[PDB]
């Protein structure tokens, strides 16, 4: 028997939000980094992590030139960054929505270990998620982010880790879709270890199949969701070398065997790649000569802002040049999500 | 760990066979009817069911005019029909392959009831399927057919029936793909009962999701398979009336939320519809203004041959006119799988 | 491959804690009622719900006569009650452990609705559960409590609700067993509605089977857990009448088909029954002439304290008589968990 | 909603048949060996495998002295052996039932490989099983036998093999229970390889949990079934040595965590052990100081008849001495299923 989780108006608003995020030429900037991660990236450059420095760095990221307006369609923020204001007086949700962006927020509470496994973790953050998502909906956020961590090892990912992470992702996506917030499913598989394209493609296909079975079990409206996978790439310790079009063929092949075409867009990770190989691999994915019935774009945290952070240097007068760095990468990734990129 | 079920040459031959079946403009004639079904269709017209009458009727079907050559890309046969010869001396596999067709065979052994359920059945025919599929591969058959039966009722389809039928379908498809035979997955849901488009779409989405999860569990090569679903239509006893484009929107919507685009083609059932509404609904499906990344065509048993059977009359001299009837329907359904059909 | 979730010392301490709780003749008093529930039970008698009244009522419950020492082996508390002191100066964990009791705590965060279902809910409280369980372990609590809610209806409990509640229960039990806290699995099925013994027994068997499959999937040590089911009883609106030994036969039959004998004890609910029928039904369960390879005892919230609450009257001088009421019920339920009870 | 698979009379007759098989002191002789297996055991002694030699060997087994009457409660036969007569004129079902035995039959069709796995097989024999079971029910057979094969390896048993074998076992048991035939579930795990007690116990617990979840999914009446597991023993190539009571503790521990007490009896395999260690291990299992709420007995094919076969020598005049050999082993195993055995 059919009891609708969503009225057609809810399905309509979720569909147009998800269509506004992955619009052609546009992608996602991931500024969702919590205090420890931004703290260690500020200690790598040599700046002590305080609240004004974080506000100023995300000010540098968000108040850039308007050439990134048909580049960035969505911005993922932290919980703290929603309630921080720019020096002009506008809050950062208004600063994003002023130039055509969509406000997002990271809503998970980290990873927690699974007992009985070999270093496998599940993820946290389901309690009070309805009230938090309603509050973030009043604060201007239209989509969310939630990250699962899986690793390829000697007998990992096991059935327990894949089943539990898919179940928690589907529960999260149901809670977000009840409040009018587009969920972005991120089943990230770690590039650590020594494994070829074959085992990464196998693991990615099994993980994505279990994720979409869990989404069908939990009555998720697939047109109002986004997918945030990795690119199918070999491990860091793997000695075999692969062309970019081989990685692109493996990625589009693993996506076409699992992902139903009702899903609106696919935004890839950077995932420890360097800043140029992300645009190279995304460009090679968008010229793969297969039929790809969804939006292929980027959701790059580090590969959008690494050069801007390093050319910032922690002092204010470098700002514009730092911003200028970011601008190139944004436009580059825009061409990388249109197949027109050439290094 | 990855152990390949198929070498790349096996994947290649399965891919080109499945591409040759659902080639643009082409569809499937289903002459797979067993002795009881063809017996009752011969008693409806008033002909006693004997071996010569069945051979002559399938002779009338298969030796038609050559205008059906870019209409029929595949023919499903019975086990008996593979070893029957035409009056010219050619066997029916040669009679099909002479004009560009691909030979198929129905390989299941019927339905068997599931205990503890309310009139729910599973399907039969897994024992010795490897030797039978190897034998049919030597006899010229390149694809197979297997039919599951599900009904919408007060609490049906239950979880047991959907899980069991998806498991048996995936086991069948693995056994067929080991022998170089393209499996055609047919999860038919019965149009009996009083239910709207909403419940049929819900049931179709749940069934197709469980089927494709079972196919991912059994390491099925999805590019070398075909899907044989129904059109999402209301029940026979349902009093509400629906447009053809509403049925088409419901069907393409239920397909886009479940079926991954690696599947080569989708061949619909007739499913108790009359002979013209099958072409009307298939035409309306092919003009649905959504993105459909697979071949949408027909696999019509009764809706290709009902008028040819009734204009045959059981006597030989009507033959050509009977054949002529079939020819129109074939060409009509060809336009129905290209969106160019107009009644 | 086997990675142990628990060392043998952890398995040993969990086993002896769970053996100390369901020791022969002993049962569990459930004082775990949160502020709204104790508030409405205090408004039914006519006392305004404040902190001193709750502390005094749980003082009346916990500081009773020492005849309940071989009656109560465990006490479930609220989070607030662990940090409340008696008038003598002892904290309530010390007040429980002084006379042979084991301290427990309710650790869930309530119920949250499941979208797409018909009034089905899952349960909450997984975030930060490791730190909270470590903190409660330092505060003297040796076991936990977590309650799932399922209802029998027209098509409920569905597969989604049973699967999700079993998964959350197994995740909770893994997190509790990592910290040395015995989890008590409570898959309560609501007695609301009109349904016989047959459908309640069917639903109880399906729910318990899915729960124990989820416990086997999550590597739960079954000797260091407890089960908190209901008695298999008809609905409130069901017109058919049943003997007590019929209810007992249905309950022991539904338990014997699902629960493996490694589970240490089974502590039943009261579940909206009146105060005498709980002891009658528990007594009838313990004289069922089947082989019952576990401890059958009680975990009664309302059926231990309803008469003590009503004879308390909200004024202090009734205290001892109120306590005296509780004492009878405790001793009665002790005989009810030994089969020696006679009204 | 509840639709009963079995009426209470069917449940009653299945319960008394299963109680008559595993009655205290009684066990099962497994003469179910097909033509290749009995052929290679006849070529090991040096007798050419013909129909008269097989009939005479099973005549030697079945027409033994009447001291095995409170030893053997059931005999598993081949399909051929049901229709063979003794020299006295009685058919072998009558020869078994004359002295208190229950006639069984092996009803599977062997093993078939699973594609995509590493040497993992499923089992065959589901087609026409209802008609075959009805026919065997008219021929005097009251129970059945069906054998699944699982092996411990580098990543085996996988999830696919365990899920598929449990599903096929539950389907078989439903079909057998519909016809009034007690199914004996045999999830045999192979002792090949190098693995300790720990990994064999882990694999046995996972396999038995998935088997009983599949039995609960298929509405199997657990009181009218029997379980045929292995003893938890190390591999053949494992260098570590274990006491018999360690093997017994591991076996009873793996059984108590999975098997619900509604199952009537547990009949162990020999499984490549020598003829005395089977009685030693079964005796040690029956003195394990845990609570075992079911019948623990034997189902020994080779460990009942190896000495009788070798002392037979293929010539008739040794017969009685050969029979005498068998008699000792039967009585020994009877004491081994009562804990009173002493070598």
């Amino acid at each position: 028997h059919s009891h609708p989780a969503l009225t057609p108006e809810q399905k309509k608003e979720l569909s147009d939000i998800a269509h506004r995020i992955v619009a052609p030429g546009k992608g996602i900037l991931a500024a969702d980094e919590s205090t420890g991660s931004i703290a260690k990236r500020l200690q790598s450059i040599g700046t002590e992590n305080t609240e004004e420095n974080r506000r100023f760095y995300r000010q540098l990221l968000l108040t850039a030139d308007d050439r990134v307006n048909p580049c960035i369609g969505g911005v993922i923020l932290f919980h703290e960054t929603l309630y921080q204001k720019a020096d002009d007086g506008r809050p950062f949700p208004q600063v994003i929505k002023s130039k055509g962006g969509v406000v997002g927020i990271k809503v998970d509470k980290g990873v927690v270990p699974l007992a009985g496994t070999n270093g496998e973790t599940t993820t946290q953050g389901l309690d009070g998620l309805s009230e938090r998502c309603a509050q973030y909906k009043k604060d201007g956020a239209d989509f969310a982010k939630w990250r699962c961590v899986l690793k390829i090892g000697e007998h990992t990912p096991s059935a327990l880790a894949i089943m539990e992470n898919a179940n928690v992702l589907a529960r999260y996506a149901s809670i977000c879709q009840q409040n009018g917030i587009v969920p972005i499913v991120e089943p990230e598989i770690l590039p650590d270890g020594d494994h070829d394209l074959k085992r990464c493609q196998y693991v990615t296909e099994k993980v994505l199949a279990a994720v979409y079975k869990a989404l069908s079990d939990h009555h998720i409206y697939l047109e109002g969701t986004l997918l945030k996978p990795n690119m199918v790439t070999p491990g860091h310790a793997c000695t075999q070398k692969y062309s970019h079009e081989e990685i692109a063929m493996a990625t589009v092949t693993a996506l076409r065997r699992t992902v139903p075409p009702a899903v609106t867009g696919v935004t890839f990770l950077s995932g420890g790649q360097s800043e140029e190989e992300a645009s190279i691999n995304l460009n090679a994915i968008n010229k793969c000569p297969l039929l790809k019935p969804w939006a292929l774009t980027f959701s790059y945290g580090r590969a959008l802002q690494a050069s801007a952070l390093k050319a910032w240097g922690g002092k204010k007068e470098n700002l514009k040049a730092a911003q200028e760095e970011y601008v190139k990468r944004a436009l580059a990734n825009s061409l990388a999500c249109q197949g027109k990129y050439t290094p």
Side-chain angles (χ1 to χ4, degrees), chain A:
Chain A
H1 187 277
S2 298
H3 291 277
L6 300 178
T7 65
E9 292 89 8
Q10 292 181 312
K11 296 185 170 185
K12 189 177 182 298
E13 54 106 16
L14 285 172
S15 176
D16 325 336
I17 289 166
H19 273 307
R20 275 203 317 274
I21 296 164
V22 292
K26 300 183 183 174
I28 304 179
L29 161 76
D32 70 91
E33 44 190 355
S34 66
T35 330
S37 60
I38 193 67
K40 71 101 170 179
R41 265 93 73 185
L42 280 170
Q43 295 290 38
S44 79
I45 189 116
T47 308
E48 147 191 9
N49 180 39
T50 188
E51 249 178 22
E52 181 57 45
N53 286 335
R54 302 196 293 258
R55 193 194 58 87
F56 182 71
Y57 178 51
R58 292 169 169 101
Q59 167 153 328
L60 181 142
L61 280 177
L62 288 176
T63 61
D65 298 299
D66 50 22
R67 295 165 296 169
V68 303
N69 292 357
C71 285
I72 302 304
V75 174
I76 315 167
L77 293 183
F78 200 64
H79 162 64
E80 182 201 7
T81 312
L82 286 186
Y83 304 134
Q84 287 188 342
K85 293 155 182 93
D87 294 343
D88 293 333
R90 292 181 301 181
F92 285 135
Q94 176 60 274
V95 124
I96 293 159
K97 292 188 258 157
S98 54
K99 52 191 190 177
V102 179
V103 182
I105 184 175
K106 157 181 178 294
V107 295
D108 48 332
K109 286 177 190 169
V111 289
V112 54
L114 278 170
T117 68
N118 197 359
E120 293 181 331
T121 54
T122 172
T123 176
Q124 208 184 49
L126 276 185
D127 308 337
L129 193 58
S130 297
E131 287 84 16
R132 290 169 62 205
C133 282
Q135 187 50 61
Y136 301 150
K137 185 59 176 177
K138 311 178 177 272
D139 299 339
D142 273 339
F143 70 96
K145 184 198 150 287
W146 182 286
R147 172 175 173 260
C148 282
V149 176
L150 291 166
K151 60 178 198 68
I152 307 182
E154 64 275 17
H155 46 266
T156 76
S158 69
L160 175 66
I162 299 171
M163 176 199 63
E164 178 66 33
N165 282 334
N167 195 71
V168 168
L169 270 164
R171 188 56 193 132
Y172 145 79
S174 127
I175 292 180
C176 274
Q177 275 196 336
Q178 276 308 288
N179 292 277
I181 284 181
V182 164
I184 296 192
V185 177
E186 183 188 355
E188 182 183 1
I189 309 174
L190 289 182
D192 294 332
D194 41 354
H195 46 76
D196 47 352
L197 275 185
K198 300 292 182 67
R199 206 191 170 167
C200 170
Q201 184 180 353
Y202 179 84
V203 163
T204 312
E205 282 166 5
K206 297 305 172 175
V207 160
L208 281 185
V211 159
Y212 276 101
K213 184 52 167 47
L215 292 190
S216 164
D217 286 337
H218 281 258
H219 321 287
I220 308 300
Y221 181 65
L222 291 185
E223 288 89 345
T225 64
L226 292 180
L227 185 65
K228 206 183 167 171
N230 47 47
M231 295 161 175
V232 175
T233 50
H236 289 317
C238 184
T239 59
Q240 197 171 337
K241 276 78 178 175
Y242 299 93
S243 167
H244 299 291
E245 64 181 0
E246 288 168 27
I247 284 177
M249 182 63 66
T251 307
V252 175
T253 305
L255 282 187
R256 281 178 91 250
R257 297 176 180 174
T258 43
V259 185
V263 192
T264 310
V266 165
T267 78
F268 285 113
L269 284 245
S270 120
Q273 289 177 356
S274 71
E275 195 157 0
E276 185 68 27
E277 313 171 14
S279 3
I280 295 299
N281 284 340
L282 182 62
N283 177 46
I285 281 171
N286 279 269
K287 343 187 74 176
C288 183
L290 296 182
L291 185 45
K292 310 163 295 279
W294 55 80
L296 287 168
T297 177
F298 55 94
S299 181
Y300 287 159
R302 180 192 165 273
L304 268 171
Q305 76 199 30
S307 322
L309 175 78
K310 198 262 285 185
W312 174 46
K315 39 184 80 10
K316 295 159 182 260
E317 76 29 63
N318 290 322
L319 176 140
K320 187 261 263 179
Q323 282 195 356
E324 183 61 39
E325 274 312 333
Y326 159 79
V327 173
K328 331 225 147 356
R329 298 309 301 161
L331 270 73
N333 293 291
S334 174
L335 300 172
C337 78
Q338 284 178 329
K340 288 187 283 290
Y341 181 59
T342 307

